[PDB]
Amino acid sequence: RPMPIKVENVSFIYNEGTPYATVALKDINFSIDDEEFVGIIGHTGSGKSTLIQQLNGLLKPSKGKIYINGIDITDKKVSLKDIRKQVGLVFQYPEYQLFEETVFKDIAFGPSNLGLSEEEVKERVYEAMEIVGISKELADKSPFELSGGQKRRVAIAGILAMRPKILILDEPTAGLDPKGKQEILNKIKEIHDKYKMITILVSHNMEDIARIADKIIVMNRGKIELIGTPREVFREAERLEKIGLSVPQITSLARELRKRGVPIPPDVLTIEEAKEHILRYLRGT
Amino acid sequence: MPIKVENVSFIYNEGTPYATVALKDINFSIDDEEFVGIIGHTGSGKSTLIQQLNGLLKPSKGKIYINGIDITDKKVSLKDIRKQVGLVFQYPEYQLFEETVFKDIAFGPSNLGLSEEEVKERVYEAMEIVGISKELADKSPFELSGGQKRRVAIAGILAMRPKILILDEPTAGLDPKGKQEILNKIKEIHDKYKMITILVSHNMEDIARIADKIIVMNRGKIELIGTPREVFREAERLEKIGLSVPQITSLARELRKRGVPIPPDVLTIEEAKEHILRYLRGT
Ligand SMILES: CCCCCCCCCCCCO[C@@H]1O[C@H](CO)[C@@H](O[C@H]2O[C@H](CO)[C@@H](O)[C@H](O)[C@H]2O)[C@H](O)[C@H]1O
Ligand SMILES: CCCCCCCCCCCCO[C@@H]1O[C@H](CO)[C@@H](O[C@H]2O[C@H](CO)[C@@H](O)[C@H](O)[C@H]2O)[C@H](O)[C@H]1O
């Protein structure tokens, strides 16, 4: 240690002033360890977006502290550049933030604003391009002549070009076809394992979250409702249902078979796991 | 037959050396009261197709009959078409809005001339259907939540009382309860008003539960047409063309391969539960 992420008693209120003041986060505590894949789920207006903005410094806590790899990022001594070297944040439909004249220039934007020599930038740009799987020959193309998917690659390379070891993605499969969805999730997981990252994935898709995550943070009206492994979390089917969420289809089935007598775990997370339990139970009867 | 599409093609930049065929020889029909799902990979021509159906695009070739009327004839206006077909685009809340909720919902029916006493009825009926309080009528749309804005946008379309309703990915961006709620209301309005509804979606699980018929697109062609069972039995083909089957269908498939008497085209957890319990009570 230090644990790479610790959020210590954080609250946030928009416009703390002020008759516009509106509480969005209340007493948030958690920590995330090395190499953990984390899922954040919760209803619309539960605070997920506000939270992830605390982690990369777009918002400062109204109370409490956030330590990234042992650095209190809430201290005035720590800039929004220092933070970008540790934490990258990919918003939804990040392709709509492409701005620059060429792919190379768009990817370079961040690291050039970070300072960094031209040699540094150029190596980071090409390293990023390779990681997200876009040919080096696209470097001199206009972003606005690329695929939807290609654009989304370029937007994400811009963030990775800063080599953060914490990567936050807000609904990265949004708008994609079903093959697109698996491809981005596979590539996220592959980059996670390869570079020993923390990855934080915010999503309304319970099925994806359940397959990919080591740990899930469940938000509810600005609070942490629950933290646990996907099994632990999706065992609370009745509670999730009441706070705007859901369980994966396959988990609901396991649940429904249990109610009627079948000795299947109620926290089966994947088709493969369900298959294996159901067949094993049949072989045993 | 309320919808008949005959030999339709469409070309982007028809000019022009940048010309691109997006739709090629489309043929199908949709019967009274059918809930139809349209699925297909990104760029397979789904959006282009639906815009043919409400006249926002005209076919390069071929014809489209709505309630017997060739809407591709120059004699048929956009207004005529908007009385029969409503089209709800993705994230319809990011459209601009009029000054108040009432005015925004009233826009379409007021453009229809139409007794303003009857505009008011259409507005308040539409508000009830999409679940927004009558007390929001005077509010400016910017004071509403994203979900509320989406309700208002949809009420504007329903206030026209179309009998064909087309929705492009209506659950987009919503939380899981949101997603179930919009799909329940869509189905409820469908059954109640005897509509045709057309839902374009990348979510195979939703499309499977709700549709009577599915149109599967692939590189600008119809690849297949059939019931959800018929379509999702073609698992290997769907995989090849950018799509997928519902999780529960995959499971059923995988259990059938290993000896379980479960149909490979189970579409819902409920069906899968019944089949599995039957095999246990059966031996
Ligand atoms: C064809 C018919 C047309 C139907 C149109 C209906 C569209 C339905 C849109 C539902 C929008 C999202 O649906 C709902 O949104 C509200 C916020 O606005 C969410 O959020 C709500 O959370 C809780 C419930 O968990 C509320 O007490 C809280 O004030 C609010 O945050 C719900 O958790 C979400 O499920
Ligand atoms: C952490 C880094 C992550 C970066 C990488 C993340 C993005 C990975 C997924 C990119 C999205 C792929 O998304 C999409 O998938 C479908 C599969 O049907 C492709 O496939 C289809 O599209 C085109 C239409 O123009 C057809 O000509 C093509 O034959 C067909 O296969 C789409 O062109 C692609 O845009």
Structure description:
Chain A: GO terms for molecular function: ATP binding; ATP hydrolysis activity; ATPase-coupled transmembrane transporter activity. Chain A: It is a peripheral membrane protein. The structure is a homodimer. The longest helix of chain A is centred in the middle third of the chain and has 18 residues, at 178-195. Chain A has helices spanning 48-55, 80-84, 103-113, 118-131, 148-160, 178-195, 206-212, 230-234, 237-242, 249-259, 271-283, and strands at residues 5-14, 22-32, 37-42, 63-68, 71-72, 87-90, 166-170, 198-202, 215-220, 223-228. In chain A, helix 3 (103-113) packs across helix 4 (118-131), helix 3 (103-113) packs parallel to helix 5 (148-160) and helix 4 (118-131) packs across helix 5. Chain A has 285 residues and is an alpha/beta fold. In chain A, the strands form two sheets. Chain A has a six-stranded mixed sheet with strand order 6-7-8-3-9-10, with helices on both faces. In chain A, strands 2-1-4-5 form a four-stranded antiparallel sheet, covered by helices on one side. Chain A has one domain: Rossmann fold (3-Layer(aba) Sandwich). The radius of gyration of chain A is 21 Å and the shape is globular. In chain A, strand 9 (215-220) and strand 10 form a beta hairpin. Helices cover 39% and strands 21% of the residues of chain A. The first copy, chain A, has eleven helices and ten strands. The A-B interface holds A 42-45, 148-149, 174-181, 204, 206-207, 244-246, 248-250, 252-253, 256-257, 260, 262, 271, 274-275, 278-279, 282, 285 and B 40-42, 145-147, 172-180, 202, 204-205, 239, 242-244, 246-248, 250-251, 254-255, 258, 260, 269-270, 272-273, 276-277, 279-280, 283. Bound molecules: dodecyl-beta-D-maltoside (2 copies).
